[PDB]
Amino acid sequence: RLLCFSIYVTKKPDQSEEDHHNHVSKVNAPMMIPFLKKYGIVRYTVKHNDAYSKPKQAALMAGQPEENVLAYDTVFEMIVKDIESIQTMQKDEEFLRTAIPDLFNFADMTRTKGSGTWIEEFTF
Amino acid sequence: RLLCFSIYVTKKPDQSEEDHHNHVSKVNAPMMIPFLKKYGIVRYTVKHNDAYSKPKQAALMAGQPEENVLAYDTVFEMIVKDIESIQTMQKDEEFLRTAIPDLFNFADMTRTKGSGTWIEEFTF
Ligand SMILES: Cc1ccc2c(c1)[C@@]1(CC1(Cl)Cl)C(=O)N2
């Protein structure tokens, strides 16, 4: 069974949506990919809730109460064979001086939520 | 850009965790796969929050406030090229007499949350 670590991010207060998503896509992602490769992450997915997606979400959620729509700006998902892969990555001294400080440039670090699940995957 | 429809499920009241996850994995999934194939869904992921994953989640979320942990029993994610793929699936008359009724046998249908996002994916 593969596992999934999900991180639900609220953007940095008073950062623009454009600036948030550009930072996430263009800076955070290349900074993280080497670590994810090194530590054996199987799949990494970045989900964006912005002006592009919002009409699509409004269509999918038509007829739903607004409170039943998730508000997070960005959601990151890391799929791994074992959580030791993630914990080892997180304590890597390079990670501590690259990825950790970078969080403060895009996330409201008072508000992050997370989960850990086991998954089933299907492709067609 | 691919899109992701995420569905956050709370189990049916008083249904056991074991009964919930067995139903989702063994019954709902084979019922959904034909529709997902037909309507051109690219990837379908089912995330489980149960006795197997919970010690793994507790380790990943060590030092986090309990309120910062997502509590959904099951999370479904459908990745598509366009939301019309999903909307057409959902109105398929076969879907209406198979997948829709089956929801009541595993989900608390007063409480489902959802989102629609645009995604970036990386494999290693
Ligand atoms: C937004 C965010 C909040 C908390 C944590 C992270 C991001 C990390 C770097 C990853 Cl993504 Cl693993 C972590 O170690 N904890």
Ligand SMILES: Cc1ccc2c(c1)[C@@]1(CC1(Cl)Cl)C(=O)N2
């Ligand atoms: C738990 C749940 C709640 C609402 C909806 C669904 C599941 C569906 C069948 C899918 Cl998964 Cl597309 C739908 O049409 N709306």
